[PDB]
Design a protein around this ligand. Structure first.
Ligand SMILES: COc1ccc(OC)c(CCC(=O)Nc2cc(-c3sc(NNc4ccccc4)nc3-c3ccc(F)cc3)ccn2)c1
Ligand SMILES: CCCCCCCCO[C@@H]1O[C@H](CO)[C@@H](O)[C@H](O)[C@H]1O
Ligand SMILES: CCCCCCCCO[C@@H]1O[C@H](CO)[C@@H](O)[C@H](O)[C@H]1O
Ligand SMILES: CCCCCCCCO[C@@H]1O[C@H](CO)[C@@H](O)[C@H](O)[C@H]1O
Length: 336
């Protein structure tokens, strides 16, 4: 229906509706990105042209997964889809997929710049992360790689959780992920929030490991070696015997680690940075914590519609994944 124009960008021919003006390259894995001006909405937007979206079953399923996820995320603190389009007029000529979202200019690293933030500022940032995480977790989604480069912040200081980094590490990963534990709790993301929050308060990386083993060494020095109740839950005979062969490190007193911080911030960090994932605070519980008193609104922390992820178990042909992807493009409804 819209009128499309062609322009060579990022060494390929882009073909976009005329509403998207002044395409300029932003960078080029999954695809190449341009910034543009959406004349229909007056928004600066980023347009991603997926690369080789249906070259293989793996590519095709990944394309479907990404479009399904972006179409489902409708929350102020999560990246959302402004538009998705293809120049194709039919399924038969469907080969290219373009995704459109708000143009973001800064991630959390750009806002922090290795500085201590004010406590009020930390409250506001962590509150928004937890608000978005409550939504994501309510859809039975685990982020699994939350970190400052995956958190965008606009000029109003509204934060959005991304599943990508902007155009130009393991320091924020939960310990069970670095041990390939599987059976991951949604609180692997809460661990990451604790690492981020600590960094916002101190201006320093909490666990700046040099490699995988160093990362775990640094974690255990803060939170201690596994206690008795955690050791009961370790089925791996190899993990058990190695853990008990280590000298016991006590859990440090967080009040004497984050000296000068808000005692409520310290209490919340103590509830996020627990080795046992079953004992970590959830996102919804964290939002009710006294630390966020000035921002918490129990009636404006919404949850997601149910999210059907049954396609993850399916082994389909390329043309089937492509057809399901085409259905999702055709059915897309722009947000208000
Ligand atoms: C024109 O003003 C700017 C001036 C300077 C400048 O820095 C060079 C930037 C860059 C800011 C930026 O990168 N902004 C941005 C990116 C995305 C991304 S980044 C990605 N993948 N990662 C990836 C891809 C290629 C290269 C590096 C990293 N995907 C999407 C994305 C995801 C879904 C969509 F629907 C659309 C785009 C989304 C929104 N804003 C801008
Ligand atoms: C001059 C720089 C680009 C300006 C905006 C082009 C906007 C296209 O906008 C679209 O144009 C279509 C054709 O008129 C109309 O049918 C649509 O209603 C209108 O939204
Ligand atoms: C768009 C929604 C962002 C918040 C939800 C992230 C949900 C988990 O999204 C993650 O995205 C990564 C992208 O490389 C994938 O590699 C991971 O497998 C996936 O779990
Ligand atoms: C030296 C061992 C260091 C890491 C101990 C990490 C314990 C994380 O916690 C564990 O996470 C598992 C996976 O979600 C859950 O199934 C367990 O019940 C939970 O206790």
């Amino acid at each position: 229906r819209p009128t499309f124009y062609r322009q060579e960008l990022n060494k390929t021919i882009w073909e976009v509706p005329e509403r998207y003006q002044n395409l300029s390259p932003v960078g080029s894995a999954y695809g190449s990105v341009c910034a543009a001006f959406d004349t229909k909405t007056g928004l600066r937007v980023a347009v991603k042209k997926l690369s080789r979206p249906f070259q293989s079953i793996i590519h095709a399923k990944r394309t479907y997964r990404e479009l399904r996820l972006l179409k489902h995320m409708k929350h102020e603190n999560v990246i959302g889809l402004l538009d998705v389009f293809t120049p194709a007029r039919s399924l038969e000529e469907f080969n290219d997929v373009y995704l459109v979202t708000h143009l973001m200019g800064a991630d959390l690293n750009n806002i922090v710049k290795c500085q201590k933030l004010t406590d009020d500022h930390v409250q506001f940032l962590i509150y928004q992360i937890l608000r978005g995480l409550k939504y994501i977790h309510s859809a039975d989604i685990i982020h699994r790689d939350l970190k400052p480069s995956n958190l965008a912040v606009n000029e109003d200081c509204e934060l959005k959780i991304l599943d990508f980094g902007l155009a130009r590490t393991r320091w924020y990963r939960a310990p069970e992920i670095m041990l390939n534990w599987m059976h991951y709790n949604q609180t692997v993301d809460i661990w990451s929030v604790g690492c981020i929050m600590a960094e916002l308060l101190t201006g320093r990386t909490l666990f700046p490991g040099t490699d995988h083993i160093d990362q775990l060494k640094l974690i255990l020095r803060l939170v201690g070696t596994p206690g008795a109740e955690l050791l009961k839950k370790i089925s791996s005979e190899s993990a058990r015997n190695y853990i008990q062969s280590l000298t016991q490190m006590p859990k440090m007193n967080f009040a004497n680690v984050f000296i000068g911080a808000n005692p409520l911030a310290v209490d919340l960090l103590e509830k996020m940075l627990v080795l046992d994932s079953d004992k970590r605070i959830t996102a919804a519980q964290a939002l009710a914590h006294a630390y966020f008193a000035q921002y918490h609104d129990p009636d404006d922390e919404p949850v997601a519609d149910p999210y059907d992820q049954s396609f993850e178990s399916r082994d389909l042909l390329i043309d089937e994944w492509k057809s399901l992807t085409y259905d999702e493009v055709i059915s897309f409804v722009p947000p208000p």
